[PDB]
Amino acid sequence: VPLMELSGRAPVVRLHDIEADMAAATDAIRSQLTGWGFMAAEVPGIGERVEAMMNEFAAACRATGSLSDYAYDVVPQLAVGGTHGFFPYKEFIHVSGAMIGDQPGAGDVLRAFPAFGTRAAEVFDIAFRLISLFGEVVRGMMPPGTPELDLSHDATNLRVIHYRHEHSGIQMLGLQLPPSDQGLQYVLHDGTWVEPVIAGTDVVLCNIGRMLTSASDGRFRPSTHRVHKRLSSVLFAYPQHKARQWKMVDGELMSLNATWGDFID
Numbered sequence: 001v002p003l004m005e006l007s008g009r010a011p012v013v014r015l016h017d018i019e020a021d022m023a024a025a026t027d028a029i030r031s032q033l034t035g036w037g038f039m040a041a042e043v044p045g046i047g048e049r050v051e052a053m054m055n056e057f058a059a060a061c062r063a064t065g066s067l068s069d070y071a072y073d074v075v076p077q078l079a080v081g082g083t084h085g086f087f088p089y090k091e092f093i094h095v096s097g098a099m100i101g102d103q104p105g106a107g108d109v110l111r112a113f114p115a116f117g118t119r120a121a122e123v124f125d126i127a128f129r130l131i132s133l134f135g136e137v138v139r140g141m142m143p144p145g146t147p148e149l150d151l152s153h154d155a156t157n158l159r160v161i162h163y164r165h166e167h168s169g170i171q172m173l174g175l176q177l178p179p180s181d182q183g184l185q186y187v188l189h190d191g192t193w194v195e196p197v198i199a200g201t202d203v204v205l206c207n208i209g210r211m212l213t214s215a216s217d218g219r220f221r222p223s224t225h226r227v228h229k230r231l232s233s234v235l236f237a238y239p240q241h242k243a244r245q246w247k248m249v250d251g252e253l254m255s256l257n258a259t260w261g262d263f264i265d
């Protein structure tokens with residue numbers, strides 16, 4: 001599978017100028033979606049923050065002073081929503097916006113492992129700003145009258161993985177953060193696979209998820225990908241589960257009965 005270098009080629013988006021740099025990168029990002037099926041930006045300084053986060057998650061996975069103390073089935077969950085917490089074995093954690101706000105006891109995993117938790121909250125905030133502006137770019141590619149994506153902070157979650165087939169996300173958008181190793185591969189519009197060069201870089205990839213495929217009525221296919229020789233993290237952005245779905249069919253906004261929560265089930 002051919003390598004796809006992105007360092008120095010994707011638009012640069014600086015940590016303390018995200019909104020303005022994303023505005024300037026808009027046309028480049030549109031052309032990536034049109035020409036690749038996924039999007040990319042280089043974010044100077046993100047790699048350091050993500051590597052530290054990942055490396056501290058790896059340390060926490062071996063501690064006993066223990067992450068399975070915060071397995072999803074013993075962590076307070078929202079009445080309506082997904083499932084944050086730790087998923088033992090290949091082993092990963094879901095750090096939701098709600099969890100970062102302690103919505104109460106749900107933030108205990110971060111109090112128990114506050115070095116990892118401080119990095120994860122930081123990376124969540126950056127990734128959520130990025131992905132919200134990626135969503136604005138995609139929205140601007142959609143017909144006039146397209147509603148705002150309305151990504152929800154509480155329902156969005158950051159996944160961090162410790163030991164790892166073709167698939168796409170179910171949610172609105174995903175933001176792949178630079179992994180520890182190479183192997184993540186994406187399919188182009190012609191059915192050929194490429195391997196973005198992202199390990200140990202500052203490059204983030206933005207994925208179309210199946211919720212946005214549905215909302216855009218098929219205009220944007222999911223950013224299908226797979227992993228093939230180890231740590232990794234990705235933000236999964238969701239709208240509010242209780243909001244009713246919508247769909248832009250042939251230029252017409254149609255409000256459906258089902259909710260976004262129904263889409264997942």
Ligand SMILES: O=C(O)CCC(=O)C(=O)O
Nearest residue numbers: 164179184227232233234
């Ligand atoms: O394991 C990785 O490097 C990325 C896994 C993946 O597909 C994702 O986080 O969405």
Ligand SMILES: [Cl-]
Nearest residue numbers: 167168169174
């Ligand atoms: Cl995914």
Ligand SMILES: [Fe+3]
Nearest residue numbers: 167168169225
């Ligand atoms: Fe994935």
